Amino acid sequence: LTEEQIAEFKEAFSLFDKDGDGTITTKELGTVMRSLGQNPTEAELQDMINEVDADGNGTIDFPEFLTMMARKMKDTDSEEEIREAFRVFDKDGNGYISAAELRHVMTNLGEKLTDEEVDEMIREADIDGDGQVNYEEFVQM
């Protein structure tokens, strides 16, 4: 329960709270998850909403989200989360992250980056110079 974790939890919560009301509905949780390549059913979305909503008001506020995310923490530098992060960036599933893919993901996180900025990120990471980023280069990044 460090300050770093709290900041990361807050940034995740703001991304999901698409209208800024301080809560996360079922449709918000759906919409953000699919923007990042996940394919949850409406059945699991309602279930995740009911599990985390403690007071039963039908939505998830930040303390409720915080209670949930504070237990059983995984690690963003773990190869398990690195693997799951590669699934997001490599959207078409060919095993290489392209600039349009990085552009599309950055767009879904709320970043307004020009195409030159994105191309620089690819270059700074592209070791073999093939113009894309594979798993090895993604990890070393």
């Binding site: 990361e8 939890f9 940034e11 995740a12 991304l15 999901f16 953000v32 998850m33 990042l36 996940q38 949850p40 699991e44 279930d47 995740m48 599990e51 985390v52 949930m68 995310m69 059983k72 923490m73 995984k74 963003t76 989360e81 690195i82 799951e84 992060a85 699934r87 997001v88 960036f89 990085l102 993901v105 950055m106 996180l109 970043e111 980056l113 900025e117 620089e120 990120m121 700074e124 990471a125 990044m141």
Partner: peptide, 29 residues
């Protein structure tokens, strides 16, 4: 019923991880 708890965390940690690398990529460049 704690499978749902597990799945929420897993889905969320992927988002947190993605955000962390997007921030870090912006941080390098």
């Amino acid at each position: 019923g704690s499978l749902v708890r597990k799945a929420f965390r897993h889905r969320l940690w992927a988002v947190i991880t993605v955000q962390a690398y997007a921030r870090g990529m912006i941080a390098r460049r």
